[PDB]
Amino acid sequence: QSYGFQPTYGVGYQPYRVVVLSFELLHAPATVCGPKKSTNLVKNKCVNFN
């Protein structure tokens, strides 16, 4: 069936774009991650570090 996306329709009729994403199991080392923090360095003070 061909889409009848006419402008003269309400919100329900109007087209939408959809993106669906999923991730695999941990069968191997991970390869995608969120960005990590990079804070300013400190010297000559007692600090916690990672």
Binding site: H27, A28, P29, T31
Partner: protein, 129 residues
Amino acid sequence: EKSNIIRGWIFGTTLDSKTQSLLIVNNATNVVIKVCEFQFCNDPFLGVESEFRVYSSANNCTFEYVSQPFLKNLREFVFKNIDGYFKIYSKHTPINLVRDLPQGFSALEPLVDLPIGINITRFQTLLAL
């Protein structure tokens, strides 16, 4: 070496159009690394890049990488698998011997690691003249 010749390697559990496998190749300009299905019909070779013939075929690949113009003369390597990581180490050294590996000490510093996550059970060498 003194003449290049040895231009890469092939690895994988099965490399005859079945099972994912790995491929590593050079032409002194860059390394080209692929993780893809292959068959290697007729033993890739230079054949003389005035004359050149590409290996196997394009198929269901899952990874790629290119970098680092790779460069008597002797080169050294190590390849190993660690629960999903594929590690490669290497060294260079010029020598005078022509029979076999000389004595002396050589410690291989590491190159970048690949988290492929796929087994290897065989391998074979790519060659050129």
